[PDB]
C-alpha cells in the first residue's frame, strides 16, 4: 500500500532534518 | 604508524560481526514473511 | 629456542585481544556456544521434541526463542553429529534437538577455558587469582542446573532450554514440582545474591558521597589520577556515617572487599548444592507435621498449604503440554480449581 | 478520522508525535558534533 | 542557650553514637512501634480472615506455624482500603481476626524507612559529605512501597499487600505470576539484571580489590590486617587491577578511574530495583507483562505453541487454584 | 557562557547546569521545552482524530487527549456520543501552531539573544539569591494559574458546559449554574481521609463541587500572586530554606512528584472529572459491573439473589459491608465504595435495594454493565485485553491504565529527583558539593562514639 | 598505552574502509536476506514452513519417540 | 567531509545509530505483521 | 478543494524550510546582518500561510 511509502518518506525526511541542522552548521562552521 | 591491517584483532571482529550481519538481514527478511 | 617457547611467545604476546594457552580451549568452545545458540534461536524448531516453535524463522521473538533441550526419548544421549540418534545428518541433527548438548558441552568447555584464562592472566599479569575462584560460583550453577539436574532427571530434556522463557519455564516448573521456593539452599542463594546487589548498591554510593575533595569541577570523576598513592575517599568518613545510621560499619577495606566477593558467590553455591538436591528429587517440598494437622483439622490453613495448592494446580494443567512425550490425558473433569474460576 | 480536506496529510499527522523524541535525540547528535565537550 | 535549642543541638549531634536528627525523631518511634507490634503478631497472634469468606489463615508460631510458614497476615478483603486502626474495632479481638496488626505494622515501616532515607540525608548533611546514599536507598523503599502500599491500591485492598511471612511472601510472588505475567515484563527483568549484574559486579570488584592488595603482612596472619583503619595510602593497586581486567576483556572494558567504577557500582543494581519496583508499582494497575499467547498460526489458523505459551499454561494452574473460596463469578477482574 | 568542561567543571552529560547562571540561555531552553509540550499536545490531538473511529467509544481505540476535550464539553452529547469531529481537531491545530511559535521563541533566547538578562532589564533579569525577584515571578505565575482555573469555571458556567457523567436523564454536557462556593464542603474535601469510603480528594463525585472547587482556587492563586509581588520572604522562611536556583528546582521537584502520584490515583478511581463514558470503566466500576452482571442474568433464570449464600456462607450476589450496607458479593466486597450514574438507582438508604433490584433493573443498566465488566482495565504490554492468561484476540488496555502507570512512574522518579536536587542544593549551599576538603574533614575533629 | 594495532577510530573514519564496506555489509545483509527468502534455510535446518505443522494424514503433535530411527520417524511425520 | 581524506567520527556514529534503530523498527513492526503477530 | 490542498502543501513544504532555515540562521553570528530579514519575511509568510489554511478551510 502507499500509505506505508509516505509515512515512511514524512518520516525519513523529518529524520535526515535534523541532522542536517547539524551537518550545515559544522559543515560552515557556525555556532556549535 | 604503518599498522598491520590483518591481525588476531581482526579475525576476531570477522568472526563475530560478518555472520552477525549475516544473520540480521536473515531475522529481517524473516520479518516479510507471511502466514 | 624451542618450539614450545617460541608459540608460548606469541600466544601470550600483548595484543588487543589476549589468546594464551587457555584460549584454545576458550575461543572455539565458547564460539562453538554462542554462535550455536544463535544458529538455533534465529532457525531451529523444536517441533519434533517439544511440539513447540522456538526460532525466529517460526516467528518467535527474542523472549520466546530458545534452543530447546532434546526429545526425552534420547535419556541422556550426549547426541554427537555422529551419533546413533543422528548418523551424521545435520538436518535430523537440529530437528532432534542436537544443538541443546552442543551449546551445554561446548558452553561447559568454554567456562572450563575462561577459568583458566583467569588464571593464566592473574600469573601473567602478577596478582592473586581471586576472581577465578569468584568464577567458581557460575560454574557450580551452569554444572548444577544445567548438567547435573538433568542427569539425575529421565533425560535432557528437563533441562533448561536456552531461551528466556524457557528459562522462565524451567523457573515455574521446579515451582511447581518441586517448591524450589521452600527449599532453604534457594533461600541462602537468594540472600547471597540480593545482599551481592546490596553491597554493590552500597558501596558504590557511600564511595562516591564520601569522595575527596581533590580537583575544582563539580564533575568529580576527573579529580582521581590511577597511579595517585592516596585513597580517594574517607574510609573514617563512611565508618562513621554507617556507624550512627545502621549501628556497624566497615573499618577494615580489605575485608569489605573480600566480603564482597563472598556473599554472592556463597549463594551460588548454596543454591547450586540444592538444584543437586532437587536433581534426585530430593526436595524441600513439605512440612509432614502441617500436612498431618490440615489432614485431621480441615480449619488450619496456613501459606506454605496454600502454596501447596498453587503447585498441584500448575502440576496438573501444565504437565500434558510440558511433557508431550507422556501423552497425558487429563480430562477437564480431574483438573484441580477452586469455585468459579 | 481527519476531515476530508485534510485526509492527503493523514501520513505526516501519523508520523508527527514522535518528533520530540527526536529532539532528545538531536542534543546527542549535537554533542557528537562538538566532541562531548 | 535556651532549652529548645540544647534539644536541637542533641537532637541533630554527630556526637551521638546512633544519630538521631529530625527524621529519626518520626522513624524511632514509627520502627519501634512497628517492630514490637510484629514480634508479638509473629509469635502470637490468632487467625486472620485475610481473603474476608470467614476462612481465618493461621500465621503465628502459637497457632501452629514454623519460621518458614509464619507470617503477620494481611487485612481482610472485607476492609479492602479502608482504615482500621485498634479504636475503630470493637473489640481487640476483632481487631485480630481481621487483620489489624498488618495495617499497624506497615503503616509504622513504612513511615519508618521513609525517615529512615531522610536521616540518612541528615547525617550526610551533618558529616559534610555528599547527600546521594538515599538516593540509593531510595530503591528498596520503592521496591518495599510498591509491594506493601502501592499494589494494594491498585487492586483496592491491603489483602492484596504482601504478606509479612516468608511463605506468604512466596504465595504473592506465586499469585502476581498467575494474574500479571510478571517473569514477562521487561521492568522485572530490568530487576533481575540488576540483582544478578549487582552480584556480579560486587564478586568482580571484591575479587580484582583482593587479587591486588598490596603485600603488607606475612603469610600467617590474615591478609586484612594489612590494611590500618584511617590509612591515607591504598591499600591494592588499581593499575595491576585495570592491567588485569583488561586483558581478561579488553583494554577499554576496563576501569582505569576508581570514582567511575564506584558510581557504575552504585548506579546498576539501583536502576535496576527502581524499574522493578516500577514492574510492580505498575502492575498495580494492572498493566501485566507480555502477553505471547497463540501469537503464532500456521497457515490454516492452528496454534504453534513457544514456551509462552507452556509458562501460560503454568499460570493458568496458579490463577484456577488460588484463593479458591474467594471467586464467585467468571474473571478474577481484581 | 562556558559550553565545556574546562570552562563550567560541568561535563557534557550534566551540560544544562552550566545554564544556571545565564538567565537568557535560560529562558530560551524553558521556552523552547514549553514549545515541546505544546508540540506534543497538538501533534498527538491530529494523530488521535486521525486514529479516530467516532462510533467507537475512545477508551477502544488508545486515545488519552479526546477524552480530555470530552470531558470539557467540546464535539459530544448525551452518552459521550461525538457530534462533531471538528472542535478535536481544532485544539490540535492551535497547540500545533502555537508550539512552532514557542520553539522559534526558545530558539531565539537560547542562540542568538543575550545570555544574561540582568544588564539588560530590572524586571525580567534575576539573581535566584534575591528573594523579592523570585517571589514576584510566583507571583505572576500564579495569577495566571488562577485565570486558568476561572476559564475552566467560565467554560462549565457560561461557555457551553461541562459532560457530567451524574446528570439525570443520562449523562451529558450540561452548563454548571450553582457551584459549590461552601467553603466547608470544598475544604472538607482536603480534610477528607486518604483511604477507603473517604478518598480525601479523589472522591469528588458531582460537577457543582469540581467548579466551586475552581473558583476558589482561582481565587485563592490570584489573592496569592499579589500577596507575592507586593512582599517578601519572611524570617522563619528565610532561615528555613535553601535560596538557590537548584533549591527552587528541587522544591517544585517535590511539589511535581505530589501531583504525578494524586493524579494516577485520581484517574484509577475517580468517574466524575474522568467519565467512564470515555476513559471506560475503573477497575472498581469493572468488578461491581461483572457482579451485577451475574446477579441480573441468574436472578432471570429464577434465583433468589437475596436468600443465595455461596460456598463460604457468604451470600453469593449480596451481603454486608463491614458497616453493614447492602453490597455486592465476591470479592468486590472490597470495592463497595465504588459509585456510579449505571448503580446508583439501584441503591436505597441502606445500601442495594432489594426492590429496585427486583423490579427496576432497566436493559441500558444490564448493556453498560456488560461493557464495563468486559472492558476492565487489565491488559498486558502489547496491549492484550482481560486477563493476562487469555489468548490474543482483544486489542485493549484501558486509558486509565496507561495515564495511572505513566504518571506513577513519573511521580516515582520526581520524587527520585526531589531528594537529587534538595540533597545537592543542601550540599552547595553548604559548599561541600564536591567532596571532602582533606585538611578540613569534619569527622577528624569530632571524638570518637566509643 | 596501546598494544599496537589501528586504533578503530582511525579504521572506521578512512575513506578505503568505507569502500570496501559499503559494499561487504550489504551483501552480507542480502546474503542472509536471500537465505530466507528463497526457502532455503527451511530446507538446511528442518524448520517446517508454516503450512508443514500438521499434514492432512498428522492432526498431532510430531513428538518423537524412538530412541534410535529418528530419520524413519521424521520421514513418516512427514 | 569536512576533515581531509576522514569522514567525521559523529557522522559515522549519526548513520550506524540510524540503521541500528532502523533493523530494530523493522522487528517491532514484524511484531505485529507476518509470523507470530497472531492474526 | 484542490487549491486548499495547494495551500496546505505549501504550509507544510515551507514549514520545512523554517525547520532547516531558523535555527541555522540563529547560529551564524557572521551571516546575521543577511538573514535576520529572511527570518522576518520567514515568520510573516508562514504566519500568512496559516491565516490562508484557515480561511480556506471555511472556504471549501
Ligand atoms: C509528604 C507526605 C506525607 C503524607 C503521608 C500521608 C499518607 C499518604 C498515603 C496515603 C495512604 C493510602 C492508603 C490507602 C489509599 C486509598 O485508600 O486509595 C488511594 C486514595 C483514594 O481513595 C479512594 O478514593 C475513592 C473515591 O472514589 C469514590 O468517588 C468517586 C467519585 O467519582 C467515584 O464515584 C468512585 O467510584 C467512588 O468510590 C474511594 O473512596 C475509595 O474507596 C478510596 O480508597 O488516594 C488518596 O486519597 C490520596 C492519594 C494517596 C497517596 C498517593 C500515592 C502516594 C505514593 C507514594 C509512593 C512513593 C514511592 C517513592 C519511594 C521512594
Ligand atoms: C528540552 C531539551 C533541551 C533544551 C531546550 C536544551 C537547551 C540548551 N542546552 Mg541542553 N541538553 C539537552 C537537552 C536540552 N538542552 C540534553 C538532553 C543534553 C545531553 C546531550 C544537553 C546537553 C547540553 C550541553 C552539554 C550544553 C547544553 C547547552 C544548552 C543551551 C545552549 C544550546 C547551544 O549552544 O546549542 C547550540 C546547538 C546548535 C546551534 C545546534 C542546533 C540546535 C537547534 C536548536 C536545533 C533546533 C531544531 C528545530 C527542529 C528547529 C525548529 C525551528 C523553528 C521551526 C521552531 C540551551 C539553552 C549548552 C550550554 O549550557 O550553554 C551555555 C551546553 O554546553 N546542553
Ligand atoms: C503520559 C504519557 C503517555 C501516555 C499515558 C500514553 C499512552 C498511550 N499512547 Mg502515547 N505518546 C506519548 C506519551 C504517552 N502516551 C509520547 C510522549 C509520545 C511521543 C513519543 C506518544 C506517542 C504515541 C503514539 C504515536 C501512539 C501512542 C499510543 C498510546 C497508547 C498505547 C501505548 C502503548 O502501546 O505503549 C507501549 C508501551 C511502551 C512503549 C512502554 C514505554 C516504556 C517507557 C520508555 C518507560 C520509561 C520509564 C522512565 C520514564 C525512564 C527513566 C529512566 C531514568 C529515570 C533512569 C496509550 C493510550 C498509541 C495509540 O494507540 O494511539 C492511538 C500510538 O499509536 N502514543
Ligand atoms: C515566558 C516567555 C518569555 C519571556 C519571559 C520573555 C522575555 C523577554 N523577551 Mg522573549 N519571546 C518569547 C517568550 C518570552 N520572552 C517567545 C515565545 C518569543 C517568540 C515570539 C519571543 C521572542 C522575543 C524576541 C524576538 C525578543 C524577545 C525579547 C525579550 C525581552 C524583552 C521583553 C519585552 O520587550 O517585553 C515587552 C513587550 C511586551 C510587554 C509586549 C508583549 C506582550 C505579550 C507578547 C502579549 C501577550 C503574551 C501572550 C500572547 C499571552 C498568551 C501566551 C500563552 C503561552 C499563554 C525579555 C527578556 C527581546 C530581547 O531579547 O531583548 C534583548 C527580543 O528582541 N523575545
Ligand atoms: C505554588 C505557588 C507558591 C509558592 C511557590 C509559594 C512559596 C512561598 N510562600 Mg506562598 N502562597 C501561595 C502560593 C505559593 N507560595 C498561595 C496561593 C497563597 C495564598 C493562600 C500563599 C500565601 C502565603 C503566605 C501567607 C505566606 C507564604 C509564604 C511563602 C514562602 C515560604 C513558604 C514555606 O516555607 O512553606 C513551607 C510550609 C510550611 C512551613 C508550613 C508547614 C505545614 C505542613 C508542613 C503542611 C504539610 C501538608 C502536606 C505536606 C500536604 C497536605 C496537602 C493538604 C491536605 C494540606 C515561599 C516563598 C510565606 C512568606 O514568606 O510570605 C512572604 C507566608 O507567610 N505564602
Ligand atoms: C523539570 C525537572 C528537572 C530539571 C529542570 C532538571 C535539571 C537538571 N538536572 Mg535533574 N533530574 C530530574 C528532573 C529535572 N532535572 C529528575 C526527575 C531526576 C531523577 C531521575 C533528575 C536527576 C538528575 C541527576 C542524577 C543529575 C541531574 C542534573 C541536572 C542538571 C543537568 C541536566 C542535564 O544536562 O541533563 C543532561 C541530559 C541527559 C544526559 C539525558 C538524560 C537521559 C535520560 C535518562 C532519558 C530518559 C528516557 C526518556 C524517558 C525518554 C525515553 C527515550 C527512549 C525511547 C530512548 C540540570 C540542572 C545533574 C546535576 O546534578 O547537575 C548539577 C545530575 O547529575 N538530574
Ligand atoms: C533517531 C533515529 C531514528 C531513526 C528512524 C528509523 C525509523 C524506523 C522505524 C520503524 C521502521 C518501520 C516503520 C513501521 C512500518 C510501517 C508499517 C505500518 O504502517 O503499520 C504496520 C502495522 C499494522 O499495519 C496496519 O495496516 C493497515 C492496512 O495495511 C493500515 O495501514 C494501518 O494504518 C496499519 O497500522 O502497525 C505497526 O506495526 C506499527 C508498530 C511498529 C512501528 C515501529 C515500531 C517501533 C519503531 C521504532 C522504535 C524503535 C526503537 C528502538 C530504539 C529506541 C531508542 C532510540
Ligand atoms: C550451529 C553449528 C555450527 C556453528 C555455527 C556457528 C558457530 C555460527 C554462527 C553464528 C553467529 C555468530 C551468528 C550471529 C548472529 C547474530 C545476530 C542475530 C545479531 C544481533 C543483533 C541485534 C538485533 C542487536 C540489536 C541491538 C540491540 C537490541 C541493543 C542496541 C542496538 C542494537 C542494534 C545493537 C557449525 C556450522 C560449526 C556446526 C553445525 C552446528
Ligand atoms: C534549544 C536546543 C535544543 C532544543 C530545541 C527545541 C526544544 C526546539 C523546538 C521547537 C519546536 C517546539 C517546534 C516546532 C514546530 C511546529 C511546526 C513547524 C508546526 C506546524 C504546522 C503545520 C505545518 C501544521 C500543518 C497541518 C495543519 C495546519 C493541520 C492539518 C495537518 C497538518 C499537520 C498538515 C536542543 C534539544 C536541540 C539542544 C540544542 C539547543
Ligand atoms: C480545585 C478542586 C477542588 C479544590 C481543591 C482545593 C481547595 C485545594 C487545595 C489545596 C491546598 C491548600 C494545598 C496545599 C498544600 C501544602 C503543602 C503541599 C505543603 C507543605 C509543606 C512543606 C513543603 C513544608 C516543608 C517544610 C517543612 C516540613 C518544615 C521545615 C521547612 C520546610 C519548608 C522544609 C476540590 C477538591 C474541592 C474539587 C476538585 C477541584
Ligand atoms: C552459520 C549456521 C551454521 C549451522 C549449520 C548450517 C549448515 C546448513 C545445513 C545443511 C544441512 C544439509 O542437509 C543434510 O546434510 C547432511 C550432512 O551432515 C546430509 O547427511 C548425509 O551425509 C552424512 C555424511 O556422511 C551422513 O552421515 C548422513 O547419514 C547422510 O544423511 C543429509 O543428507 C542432508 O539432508
Ligand atoms: C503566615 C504568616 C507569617 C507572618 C510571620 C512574620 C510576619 C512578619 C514578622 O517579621 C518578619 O519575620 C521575621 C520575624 O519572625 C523577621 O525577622 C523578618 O524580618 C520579618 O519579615
Ligand atoms: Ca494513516
Ligand atoms: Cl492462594
Ligand atoms: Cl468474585
Ligand atoms: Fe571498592
Not at chain 2, 563475530?16 to 502466514?35: D, E, T
Not at chain 3, 526463542?65 to 541433527?93: K, M
Not at chain 5, 583488561?246 to 543494581?269: E, K, V
Not at chain 7, 498431532?60 to 512427514?78: G, H
Amino acid at each position: 500500500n502507499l500509505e506505508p511509502i509516505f509515512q515512511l518518506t514524512f518520516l525519513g525526511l523529518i529524520v535526515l532534518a535534523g541532522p542536517a541542522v547539524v551537518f550545515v552548521l559544522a559543515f560552515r562552521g557556525g555556532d556549535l | 604508524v604503518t599498522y598491520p591491517i590483518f591481525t588476531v584483532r581482526w579475525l576476531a571482529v570477522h568472526t563475530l560481526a560478518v555472520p552477525s550481519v549475516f544473520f540480521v538481514g536473515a531475522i529481517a527478511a524473516m520479518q516479510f514473511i507471511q502466514r | 629456542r624451542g618450539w614450545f617457547d617460541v608459540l608460548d611467545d606469541w600466544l601470550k604476546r600483548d595484543r588487543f585481544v589476549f589468546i594464551g594457552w587457555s584460549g584454545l580451549l576458550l575461543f572455539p568452545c565458547a564460539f562453538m556456544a554462542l554462535g550455536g545458540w544463535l544458529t538455533g534461536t534465529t532457525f531451529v524448531t523444536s517441533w519434533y521434541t517439544h511440539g513447540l516453535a522456538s526460532s525466529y524463522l517460526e516467528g518467535a521473538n527474542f523472549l520466546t526463542v530458545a534452543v530447546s533441550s532434546p526429545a526425552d526419548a534420547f535419556g541422556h544421549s550426549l547426541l554427537f553429529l555422529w551419533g546413533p540418534e543422528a548418523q551424521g545428518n545435520l538436518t535430523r541433527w537440529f530437528q532432534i534437538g542436537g544443538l541443546w548438548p552442543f551449546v551445554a558441552l561446548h558452553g561447559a568447555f568454554g567456562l572450563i577455558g575462561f577459568m583458566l584464562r583467569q588464571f593464566e592472566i592473574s600469573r601473567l599479569v602478577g596478582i592473586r587469582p581471586y576472581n577465578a575462584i569468584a568464577f567458581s560460583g557460575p560454574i557450580a550453577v551452569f554444572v548444577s542446573v544445567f548438567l547435573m539436574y538433568p542427569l539425575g532427571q529421565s533425560s535432557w530434556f528437563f533441562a533448561p532450554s536456552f531461551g528466556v522463557a524457557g528459562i522462565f519455564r524451567f523457573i515455574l516448573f521446579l515451582q511447581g514440582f518441586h517448591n524450589w521456593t521452600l527449599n532453604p539452599f534457594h533461600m541462602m542463594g537468594v540472600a547471597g545474591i540480593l545482599g551481592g546487589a546490596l553491597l554493590c548498591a552500597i558501596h558504590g554510593a557511600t564511595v562516591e558521597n564520601t569522595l575527596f575533595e581533590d580537583g575544582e569541577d563539580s564533575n568529580t570523576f576527573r579529580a582521581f589520577e590511577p597511579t595517585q598513592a592516596e585513597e580517594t575517599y574517607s574510609m573514617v568518613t563512611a565508618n562513621r556515617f554507617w556507624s550512627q545510621i545502621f549501628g556497624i560499619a566497615f573499618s577494615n577495606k580489605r575485608w569489605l572487599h573480600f566480603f564482597m566477593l563472598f556473599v554472592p558467590v556463597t549463594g551460588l553455591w548454596m543454591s547450586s548444592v540444592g538444584i543437586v538436591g532437587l536433581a534426585l528429587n530430593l526436595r524441600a517440598y513439605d512440612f509432614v507435621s502441617q500436612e498431618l494437622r490440615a489432614a485431621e483439622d480441615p480449619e488450619f490453613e496456613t501459606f506454605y498449604t496454600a502454596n501447596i495448592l498453587l503447585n498441584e494446580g500448575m502440576r496438573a494443567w501444565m504437565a500434558p503440554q510440558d511433557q508431550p512425550h507422556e501423552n497425558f490425558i487429563f480430562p477437564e473433569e480431574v483438573l484441580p480449581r477452586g469455585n468459579a474460576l | 478520522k481527519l476531515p476530508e480536506a485534510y485526509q492527503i496529510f493523514d501520513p505526516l499527522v501519523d508520523v508527527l508525535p514522535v518528533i520530540p523524541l527526536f529532539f532528545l535525540a538531536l542534543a546527542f547528535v549535537w554533542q557528537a558534533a562538538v566532541g562531548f565537550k | 542557650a535556651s532549652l529548645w535549642e540544647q534539644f536541637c543541638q542533641w537532637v541533630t549531634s554527630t556526637n551521638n553514637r546512633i544519630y538521631v536528627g529530625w527524621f529519626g525523631t518520626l522513624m524511632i518511634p514509627t520502627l519501634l512501634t512497628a517492630t514490637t507490634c510484629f514480634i508479638i503478631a509473629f509469635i502470637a497472634a490468632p487467625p486472620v480472615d485475610i481473603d474476608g469468606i470467614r476462612e481465618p489463615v493461621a500465621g503465628s508460631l502459637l497457632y501452629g506455624n514454623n519460621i518458614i510458614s509464619g507470617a503477620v497476615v494481611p487485612s481482610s478483603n472485607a476492609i479492602g482500603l479502608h482504615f482500621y486502626p485498634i479504636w475503630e474495632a470493637a473489640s481487640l479481638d476483632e481487631w485480630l481476626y481481621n487483620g489489624g496488626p498488618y495495617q499497624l505494622v506497615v503503616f509504622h515501616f513504612l513511615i519508618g524507612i521513609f525517615c529512615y532515607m531522610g536521616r540518612q540525608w541528615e547525617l550526610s548533611y551533618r558529616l559534610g559529605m555528599r547527600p546521594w546514599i538515599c538516593v540509593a536507598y531510595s530503591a528498596p523503599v520503592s521496591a518495599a512501597t510498591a509491594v506493601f502500599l502501592i499494589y494494594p491500591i491498585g487492586q483496592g485492598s491491603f489483602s492484596d499487600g504482601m504478606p509479612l511471612g516468608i511463605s506468604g511472601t512466596f504465595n504473592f510472588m506465586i499469585v502476581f505470576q498467575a494474574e500479571h505475567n510478571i517473569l514477562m515484563h521487561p521492568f522485572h527483568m530490568l530487576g533481575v539484571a540488576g540483582v544478578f549484574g549487582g552480584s556480579l559486579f560486587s564478586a568482580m570488584h571484591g575479587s580484582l580489590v583482593t587479587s591486588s592488595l598490596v603485600r603488607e603482612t606475612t603469610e600467617v596472619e590474615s591478609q586484612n590486617y594489612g590494611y590500618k583503619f584511617g590509612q591515607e595510602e591504598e591499600t591494592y593497586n588499581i593499575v595491576a587491577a585495570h592491567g588485569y581486567f583488561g586483558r581478561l576483556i579488553f583494554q577499554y572494558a576496563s576501569f582505569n578511574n576508581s570514582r567511575s567504577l564506584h558510581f557504575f557500582l552504585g548506579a546498576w543494581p539501583v536502576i535496576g530495583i527502581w524499574f522493578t519496583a516500577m514492574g510492580v508499582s505498575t502492575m498495580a494497575f494492572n498493566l501485566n507483562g507480555f502477553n505471547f499467547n497463540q501469537s503464532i498460526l500456521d497457515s490454516q489458523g492452528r496454534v504453534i505453541g513457544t514456551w509462552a505459551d507452556v509458562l501460560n499454561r503454568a499460570n493458568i494452574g496458579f490463577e484456577v487454584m488460588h484463593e479458591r473460596n474467594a471467586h464467585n463469578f467468571p474473571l478474577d477482574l481484581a | 557562557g562556558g559550553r565545556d568542561l574546562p570552562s563550567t567543571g560541568f561535563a557534557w552529560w550534566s551540560g544544562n547546569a552550566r545554564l544556571i547562571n545565564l538567565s537568557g540561555k535560560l529562558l530560551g531552553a524553558h521556552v523552547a521545552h514549553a514549545g515541546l509540550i505544546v508540540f506534543w499536545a497538538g501533534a498527538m490531538t491530529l494523530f488521535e482524530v486521525a486514529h479516530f473511529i467516532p462510533e467507537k467509544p475512545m477508551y477502544e481505540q488508545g486515545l488519552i487527549l479526546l477524552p480530555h476535550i470530552a470531558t470539557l464539553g467540546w464535539g459530544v452529547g448525551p452518552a459521550g456520543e461525538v457530534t462533531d469531529i471538528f472542535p478535536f481537531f481544532v485544539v490540535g491545530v492551535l497547540h500545533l501552531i502555537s508550539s512552532a511559535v514557542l520553539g522559534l521563541g526558545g530558539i531565539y533566547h537560547a542562540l542568538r539573544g543575550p545570555e544574561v538578562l540582568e544588564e539588560y532589564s530590572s524586571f525580567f533579569g534575576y539573581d535566584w539569591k534575591d528573594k523579592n525577584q523570585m517571589t514576584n515571578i510566583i507571583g505572576y505565575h500564579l495569577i495566571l494559574l488562577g485565570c486558568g482555573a476561572l476559564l475552566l469555571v467560565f467554560k462549565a458556567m457560561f461557555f457551553g458546559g461541562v459532560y457530567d457523567t451524574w446528570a439525570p436523564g443520562g449523562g451529558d454536557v450540561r452548563v454548571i449554574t450553582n457551584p459549590t462556593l461552601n467553603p466547608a464542603i470544598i475544604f472538607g474535601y482536603l480534610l477528607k481521609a486518604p483511604f477507603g469510603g473517604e478518598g480525601w480528594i479523589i472522591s469528588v463525585n458531582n460537577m457543582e463541587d469540581i467548579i466551586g472547587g475552581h473558583i476558589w482556587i482561582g481565587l485563592i492563586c490570584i489573592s496569592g500572586g499579589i500577596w507575592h509581588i507586593l512582599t517578601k520572604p519572611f524570617g522563619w522562611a528565610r532561615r528555613a530554606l535553601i535560596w538557590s536556583g537548584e533549591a527552587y528546582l528541587s522544591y517544585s521537584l517535590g511539589a511535581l512528584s505530589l501531583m504525578g502520584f494524586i493524579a494516577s490515583v485520581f484517574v484509577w478511581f475517580n468517574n466524575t472529572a474522568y467519565p467512564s463514558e470515555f476513559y471506560g470503566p475503573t477497575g472498581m466500576e469493572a468488578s461491581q459491573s461483572q457482579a451485577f452482571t451475574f446477579l441480573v442474568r441468574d436472578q432471570r433464570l429464577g434465583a433468589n439473589i437475596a436468600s443465595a449464600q455461596g460456598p463460604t456462607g457468604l451470600g453469593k450476589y449480596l451481603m454486608r459491608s463491614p458497616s453493614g450496607e447492602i453490597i455486592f458479593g465476591g470479592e468486590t466486597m472490597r470495592f463497595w465504595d465504588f459509585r456510579g450514574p449505571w448503580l446508583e438507582p439501584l441503591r436505597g438508604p441502606n445500601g442495594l435495594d432489594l426492590d429496585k433490584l427486583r423490579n427496576d433493573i432497566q436493559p441500558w443498566q444490564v448493556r453498560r454493565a456488560a461493557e464495563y465488566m468486559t472492558h476492565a482495565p487489565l491488559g498486558s504490554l502489547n496491549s492484550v485485553g482481560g486477563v493476562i492468561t487469555d489468548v490474543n484476540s482483544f486489542n485493549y488496555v484501558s486509558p486509565r491504565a496507561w495515564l495511572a502507570t505513566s504518571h506513577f512512574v513519573l511521580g516515582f522518579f520526581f520524587l527520585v529527583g526531589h531528594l537529587w536536587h534538595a540533597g545537592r542544593a543542601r550540599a552547595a549551599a553548604a559548599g561541600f558539593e564536591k567532596g571532602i576538603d582533606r585538611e578540613t574533614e569534619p569527622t577528624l575533629f569530632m571524638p570518637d562514639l566509643d | 598505552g596501546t598494544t599496537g594495532e589501528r586504533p578503530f577510530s582511525d579504521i572506521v573514519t578512512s575513506i578505503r574502509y568505507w569502500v570496501i564496506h559499503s559494499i561487504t555489509i550489504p551483501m552480507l545483509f542480502i546474503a542472509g536476506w536471500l537465505f530466507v527468502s528463497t526457502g532455503l534455510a527451511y530446507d538446511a535446518f528442518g524448520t517446517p514452513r508454516p503450512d508443514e505443522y500438521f499434514t492432512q494424514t498428522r492432526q498431532e503433535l510430531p513428538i518423537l519417540q524412538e530412541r534410535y530411527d529418528i530419520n524413519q520417524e521424521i520421514q513418516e511425520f512427514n | 567531509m569536512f576533515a581531509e581524506g576522514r569522514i567525521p567520527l559523529w557522522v559515522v556514529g549519526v548513520v550506524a545509530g540510524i540503521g541500528a534503530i532502523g533493523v530494530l523498527g523493522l522487528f517491532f513492526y514484524g511484531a505485529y505483521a507476518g509470523l507470530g503477530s497472531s492474526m | 478543494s484542490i487549491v486548499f490542498q495547494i495551500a496546505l502543501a505549501a504550509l507544510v513544504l515551507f514549514s520545512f524550510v523554517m525547520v532547516v532555515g531558523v535555527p541555522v540562521a540563529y547560529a551564524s553570528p557572521q551571516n546575521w546582518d543577511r538573514s535576520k530579514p529572511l527570518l522576518y519575511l520567514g515568520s510573516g509568510i508562514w504566519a500568512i500561510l496559516v491565516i490562508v489554511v484557515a480561511l480556506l478551510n471555511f472556504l471549501v
